Design a binder for this molecule. Sequence first.
Ligand SMILES: O=c1ccn([C@H]2C[C@H](O)[C@@H](COP(=O)(O)OP(=O)(O)O)O2)c(=O)[nH]1
Lengths: 370, 373
Amino acid sequence: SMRALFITSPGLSHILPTVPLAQALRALGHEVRYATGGDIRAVAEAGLCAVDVSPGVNYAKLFVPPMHSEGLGEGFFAEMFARVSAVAVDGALRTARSWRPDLVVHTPTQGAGPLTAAALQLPCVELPLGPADSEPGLGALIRRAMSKDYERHGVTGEPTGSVRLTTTPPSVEALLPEDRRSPGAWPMRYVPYNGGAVLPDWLPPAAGRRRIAVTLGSIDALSGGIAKLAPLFSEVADVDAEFVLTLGGGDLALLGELPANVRVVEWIPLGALLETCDAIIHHGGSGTLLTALAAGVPQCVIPHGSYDTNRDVLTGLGIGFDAEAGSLGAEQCRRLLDDAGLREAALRVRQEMSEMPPPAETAAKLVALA
Amino acid sequence: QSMRALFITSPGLSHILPTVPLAQALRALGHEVRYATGGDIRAVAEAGLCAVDVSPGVNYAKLFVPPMHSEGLGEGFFAEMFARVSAVAVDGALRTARSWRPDLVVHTPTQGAGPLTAAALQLPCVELPLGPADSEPGLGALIRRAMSKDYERHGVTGEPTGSVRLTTTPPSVEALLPEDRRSPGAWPMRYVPYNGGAVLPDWLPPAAGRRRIAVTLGSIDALSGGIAKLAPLFSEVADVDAEFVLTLGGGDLALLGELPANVRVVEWIPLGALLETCDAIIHHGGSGTLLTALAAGVPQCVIPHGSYQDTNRDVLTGLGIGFDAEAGSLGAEQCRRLLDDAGLREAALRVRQEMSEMPPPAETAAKLVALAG
Ligand SMILES: O=c1ccn([C@H]2C[C@H](O)[C@@H](COP(=O)(O)OP(=O)(O)O)O2)c(=O)[nH]1
């Protein structure tokens, strides 16, 4: 059996899209082990095995410890990701030494991954969460910022191999800026993984009754973001459709009673939901976006520029459109459900995604590389 | 279009678990997997997969159980029993199949709702057994008969289109089974342990030159005054130059009473992960435990039930990978035998090699996609 060590960022959304691959390898009769922290339990809930490389560590404190200030760039974030990776290094190394992998899989911001691969002279595989996760020269910079961590464990090497995986289909890829394109990367089909579930009664869709998923995302929902959707839900009663709202932690009490045609659930796997849905309104999460694409379903994105890159994609491909929360209502919903061009394009991209090699295939490719 | 696979399984944990690799494999190929079961259903969810509860609220214990002169003290009794248990899944299985529209039904041998559903919708079905034990002759054919009333009600007059039988049993083990328990023409699939996912503990990585023996009674059998069995063993293990790892699986710890220093206790830990770091295993004769141990290429000691005459003794003996031992007479002697007897290890290793030559679940999944597609 080949042995694959998955060294990931502690965050749920970085972990989840690695599961298909891990799962795929186990399916080939090989061995998979994770080496992470934070939202590690998600690995266990996926039928896989994980080692906690940073027990007790408070990540929040770690992440967070200008007119004139320099270094308002990638360097700030590289530094930040280095501090977070730092607390995984020792753990990752002990595990790698005892468990002895043939291959390191890592996520782009997890600096412990290439460090470990370099230390043990193994190849590494970069597995990104999606299009957003393609910050230019991020990896090289994280490495630099971790110099002190490399030098302490006596690591002068570069890992053996450096494969980059991509789950982004070619047409989406084309619409990204040149410096965010990853050419020569191994394409792998995006296979939604959102968690396993005992599915509810109501999931199977009623006869001739259309359905719109509304998702806040696992993150922005707890900020106080449910408020955002108040205008929407003040007009949905007028819409000849069923709405499914996933809270993902958000406070219901912020708006309270919703119309009869709105169903509320805390969590449900997105892939499973969209299988039965006609359209989706969301926040612009990468995982949510790719999942929706995969489902071949029109999309509406409530943008928000605290920082997105997802406007030009939906527009460019013609699978969807953007809409400000304050001006979001029945009309957008109608457009989602009736606009033929949105559906065909959605379907078009889905087809493209299904032509990309599945994770099973990608796994076979790696097994030999190791 | 993804191919769609409906997994209709027995409500029991141990029947569910060995189906995961396959399901998992299909997802990996970019296809769709959905389970349709009850009872220990939440294990499906914890495996990263999706499930429909076909029998919510149902009390299974009441279902399973409500000499010299009675009659039919045979397979017919168990067929009838399995029919009653399957019965409560039928309606659910059918609704799901109708709405979800699978291309392929995957079932476990005692789950009668599986072939019923495959027959009703004229789909092929795939039998996936838990291991060698799960090969009662003509069990399926008899469950069907006992479920006649269930078939006739949903107006099912026909047979599923296809009937593929999977086997995770390696050829050498297969040869040592009685003829009527052999499944020839069955598609071989590599046994890939699946026991559940875990956040693995500190101590799992094994110390330098320190040998380790796993002791386990399983997910069941350790319950309700069954841990007592191992009291003689733990009264002698202190003498053994090795580390012992005991998995409680619900058993009352206090019953063993006093433990030596060289014994570590954990409630639960995935068996595959444990045995990777172990030199040998003492167990109860669990079918998933046995194949896992084989896969680990590891000598085995088995504790028999006095209630039923399993076939496991002859396999272990026949292959020379292990031996049997009564709980009352189980001690340091056997442990030493496990760790030092060269023949046990080589044989164990030999069978492991054989298992690794069988097609993995990924390959088997591909084969099915063609069968249904
Ligand atoms: O601590 C434990 C206890 C049980 N198991 C798993 C191993 C095995 O795959 C399953 C049960 O084994 P079985 O003998 O097939 O089932 P039963 O208990 O029904 O005999 O539970 C573990 O992984 N760790």
